[PDB]
mmCIF file with all atom_site columns, C-alpha atoms in Angstrom:
data_model
loop_
_atom_site.group_PDB
_atom_site.id
_atom_site.type_symbol
_atom_site.label_atom_id
_atom_site.label_alt_id
_atom_site.label_comp_id
_atom_site.label_asym_id
_atom_site.label_entity_id
_atom_site.label_seq_id
_atom_site.pdbx_PDB_ins_code
_atom_site.Cartn_x
_atom_site.Cartn_y
_atom_site.Cartn_z
_atom_site.occupancy
_atom_site.B_iso_or_equiv
_atom_site.pdbx_formal_charge
_atom_site.auth_seq_id
_atom_site.auth_comp_id
_atom_site.auth_asym_id
_atom_site.auth_atom_id
_atom_site.pdbx_PDB_model_num
ATOM 1  C CA . UNK T 1 1  ? 6.088   -12.864 16.132 1.00 0.00 ? 1  UNK T CA 1
ATOM 2  C CA . UNK T 1 2  ? 4.985   -9.999  18.029 1.00 0.00 ? 2  UNK T CA 1
ATOM 3  C CA . UNK T 1 3  ? 1.840   -7.559  18.588 1.00 0.00 ? 3  UNK T CA 1
ATOM 4  C CA . UNK T 1 4  ? 2.952   -5.287  15.417 1.00 0.00 ? 4  UNK T CA 1
ATOM 5  C CA . UNK T 1 5  ? 2.773   -8.503  13.161 1.00 0.00 ? 5  UNK T CA 1
ATOM 6  C CA . UNK T 1 6  ? -0.193  -10.009 15.271 1.00 0.00 ? 6  UNK T CA 1
ATOM 7  C CA . UNK T 1 7  ? -2.240  -7.048  14.641 1.00 0.00 ? 7  UNK T CA 1
ATOM 8  C CA . UNK T 1 8  ? -1.895  -7.311  10.799 1.00 0.00 ? 8  UNK T CA 1
ATOM 9  C CA . UNK T 1 9  ? -2.650  -11.095 10.868 1.00 0.00 ? 9  UNK T CA 1
ATOM 10 C CA . UNK T 1 10 ? -5.647  -10.545 13.328 1.00 0.00 ? 10 UNK T CA 1
ATOM 11 C CA . UNK T 1 11 ? -7.248  -7.498  11.056 1.00 0.00 ? 11 UNK T CA 1
ATOM 12 C CA . UNK T 1 12 ? -6.960  -9.694  7.953  1.00 0.00 ? 12 UNK T CA 1
ATOM 13 C CA . UNK T 1 13 ? -9.248  -12.409 9.307  1.00 0.00 ? 13 UNK T CA 1
ATOM 14 C CA . UNK T 1 14 ? -12.148 -9.994  10.029 1.00 0.00 ? 14 UNK T CA 1
ATOM 15 C CA . UNK T 1 15 ? -11.291 -8.521  6.411  1.00 0.00 ? 15 UNK T CA 1
ATOM 16 C CA . UNK T 1 16 ? -11.698 -12.051 4.871  1.00 0.00 ? 16 UNK T CA 1
ATOM 17 C CA . UNK T 1 17 ? -15.331 -11.852 6.031  1.00 0.00 ? 17 UNK T CA 1
ATOM 18 C CA . UNK T 1 18 ? -16.127 -8.604  5.134  1.00 0.00 ? 18 UNK T CA 1
ATOM 19 C CA . UNK T 1 19 ? -15.880 -7.098  8.542  1.00 0.00 ? 19 UNK T CA 1
ATOM 20 C CA . UNK T 1 20 ? -13.636 -3.945  10.090 1.00 0.00 ? 20 UNK T CA 1
ATOM 21 C CA . UNK T 1 21 ? -12.483 -3.879  13.657 1.00 0.00 ? 21 UNK T CA 1
ATOM 22 C CA . UNK T 1 22 ? -12.047 -0.760  15.977 1.00 0.00 ? 22 UNK T CA 1
ATOM 23 C CA . UNK T 1 23 ? -8.659  0.350   17.624 1.00 0.00 ? 23 UNK T CA 1
ATOM 24 C CA . UNK T 1 24 ? -9.774  -0.336  21.056 1.00 0.00 ? 24 UNK T CA 1
ATOM 25 C CA . UNK T 1 25 ? -11.256 -3.919  19.865 1.00 0.00 ? 25 UNK T CA 1
ATOM 26 C CA . UNK T 1 26 ? -7.867  -4.964  17.684 1.00 0.00 ? 26 UNK T CA 1
ATOM 27 C CA . UNK T 1 27 ? -5.728  -4.259  20.975 1.00 0.00 ? 27 UNK T CA 1
ATOM 28 C CA . UNK T 1 28 ? -8.046  -6.246  23.179 1.00 0.00 ? 28 UNK T CA 1
ATOM 29 C CA . UNK T 1 29 ? -8.154  -9.471  20.866 1.00 0.00 ? 29 UNK T CA 1
ATOM 30 C CA . UNK T 1 30 ? -4.165  -8.616  20.413 1.00 0.00 ? 30 UNK T CA 1
ATOM 31 C CA . UNK T 1 31 ? -3.417  -8.958  24.114 1.00 0.00 ? 31 UNK T CA 1
ATOM 32 C CA . UNK T 1 32 ? -6.011  -12.346 24.305 1.00 0.00 ? 32 UNK T CA 1
ATOM 33 C CA . UNK T 1 33 ? -4.038  -13.823 21.455 1.00 0.00 ? 33 UNK T CA 1
ATOM 34 C CA . UNK T 1 34 ? -0.440  -12.651 22.451 1.00 0.00 ? 34 UNK T CA 1
ATOM 35 C CA . UNK T 1 35 ? 0.956   -16.116 23.064 1.00 0.00 ? 35 UNK T CA 1
ATOM 36 C CA . UNK T 1 36 ? -1.108  -18.271 20.593 1.00 0.00 ? 36 UNK T CA 1
ATOM 37 C CA . UNK T 1 37 ? 0.838   -20.298 17.974 1.00 0.00 ? 37 UNK T CA 1
ATOM 38 C CA . UNK T 1 38 ? 1.581   -17.997 14.826 1.00 0.00 ? 38 UNK T CA 1
ATOM 39 C CA . UNK T 1 39 ? 0.489   -20.987 12.596 1.00 0.00 ? 39 UNK T CA 1
ATOM 40 C CA . UNK T 1 40 ? -2.917  -21.367 14.794 1.00 0.00 ? 40 UNK T CA 1
ATOM 41 C CA . UNK T 1 41 ? -3.803  -17.513 15.249 1.00 0.00 ? 41 UNK T CA 1
ATOM 42 C CA . UNK T 1 42 ? -6.242  -17.681 12.016 1.00 0.00 ? 42 UNK T CA 1
ATOM 43 C CA . UNK T 1 43 ? -7.971  -20.783 13.382 1.00 0.00 ? 43 UNK T CA 1
ATOM 44 C CA . UNK T 1 44 ? -8.239  -19.593 16.939 1.00 0.00 ? 44 UNK T CA 1
ATOM 45 C CA . UNK T 1 45 ? -9.485  -16.151 15.893 1.00 0.00 ? 45 UNK T CA 1
ATOM 46 C CA . UNK T 1 46 ? -12.257 -17.609 13.674 1.00 0.00 ? 46 UNK T CA 1
ATOM 47 C CA . UNK T 1 47 ? -13.787 -18.774 16.744 1.00 0.00 ? 47 UNK T CA 1
ATOM 48 C CA . UNK T 1 48 ? -14.550 -15.216 17.795 1.00 0.00 ? 48 UNK T CA 1
ATOM 49 C CA . UNK T 1 49 ? -15.837 -14.265 14.176 1.00 0.00 ? 49 UNK T CA 1
ATOM 50 C CA . UNK T 1 50 ? -18.246 -17.423 14.695 1.00 0.00 ? 50 UNK T CA 1
ATOM 51 C CA . UNK T 1 51 ? -19.364 -15.662 17.821 1.00 0.00 ? 51 UNK T CA 1
ATOM 52 C CA . UNK T 1 52 ? -19.550 -12.201 16.421 1.00 0.00 ? 52 UNK T CA 1
ATOM 53 C CA . UNK T 1 53 ? -21.822 -13.489 13.517 1.00 0.00 ? 53 UNK T CA 1
ATOM 54 C CA . UNK T 1 54 ? -24.599 -14.708 16.253 1.00 0.00 ? 54 UNK T CA 1
ATOM 55 C CA . UNK T 1 55 ? -24.373 -11.424 18.307 1.00 0.00 ? 55 UNK T CA 1
ATOM 56 C CA . UNK T 1 56 ? -26.684 -8.281  18.104 1.00 0.00 ? 56 UNK T CA 1
ATOM 57 C CA . UNK T 1 57 ? -25.049 -5.770  15.884 1.00 0.00 ? 57 UNK T CA 1
ATOM 58 C CA . UNK T 1 58 ? -26.084 -2.976  12.814 1.00 0.00 ? 58 UNK T CA 1
ATOM 59 C CA . UNK T 1 59 ? -22.779 -2.307  11.171 1.00 0.00 ? 59 UNK T CA 1
ATOM 60 C CA . UNK T 1 60 ? -19.547 -4.451  9.437  1.00 0.00 ? 60 UNK T CA 1
ATOM 61 C CA . UNK T 1 61 ? -17.533 -2.277  12.284 1.00 0.00 ? 61 UNK T CA 1
ATOM 62 C CA . UNK T 1 62 ? -16.775 -4.538  15.503 1.00 0.00 ? 62 UNK T CA 1
ATOM 63 C CA . UNK T 1 63 ? -16.077 -3.047  18.596 1.00 0.00 ? 63 UNK T CA 1
ATOM 64 C CA . UNK T 1 64 ? -14.560 -4.001  22.105 1.00 0.00 ? 64 UNK T CA 1
ATOM 65 C CA . UNK T 1 65 ? -17.846 -4.666  23.571 1.00 0.00 ? 65 UNK T CA 1
ATOM 66 C CA . UNK T 1 66 ? -18.767 -6.999  20.949 1.00 0.00 ? 66 UNK T CA 1
ATOM 67 C CA . UNK T 1 67 ? -15.122 -8.822  21.135 1.00 0.00 ? 67 UNK T CA 1
ATOM 68 C CA . UNK T 1 68 ? -15.165 -9.021  24.885 1.00 0.00 ? 68 UNK T CA 1
ATOM 69 C CA . UNK T 1 69 ? -18.410 -11.380 24.587 1.00 0.00 ? 69 UNK T CA 1
ATOM 70 C CA . UNK T 1 70 ? -17.011 -12.917 21.409 1.00 0.00 ? 70 UNK T CA 1
ATOM 71 C CA . UNK T 1 71 ? -13.811 -14.077 23.000 1.00 0.00 ? 71 UNK T CA 1
ATOM 72 C CA . UNK T 1 72 ? -16.086 -16.366 25.474 1.00 0.00 ? 72 UNK T CA 1
ATOM 73 C CA . UNK T 1 73 ? -17.074 -18.687 22.958 1.00 0.00 ? 73 UNK T CA 1
ATOM 74 C CA . UNK T 1 74 ? -13.280 -19.071 21.465 1.00 0.00 ? 74 UNK T CA 1
ATOM 75 C CA . UNK T 1 75 ? -11.996 -19.591 25.174 1.00 0.00 ? 75 UNK T CA 1
#
């Protein structure tokens, strides 16, 4: 369990909801979730997605500025 596997797990959680995630944004939450339990990573990141779903946006492409505020509700 390392960032190179975390990235694939984390991108898939946004893809399952119909979103896409920027390279600066995937890195941001990859560092924020670096030590989270491998079987809880999806349930944890789902709290970020639930915050993105109530933030102002205009595309399915999520960005670092959106995640940097969505993580605050997941904390």
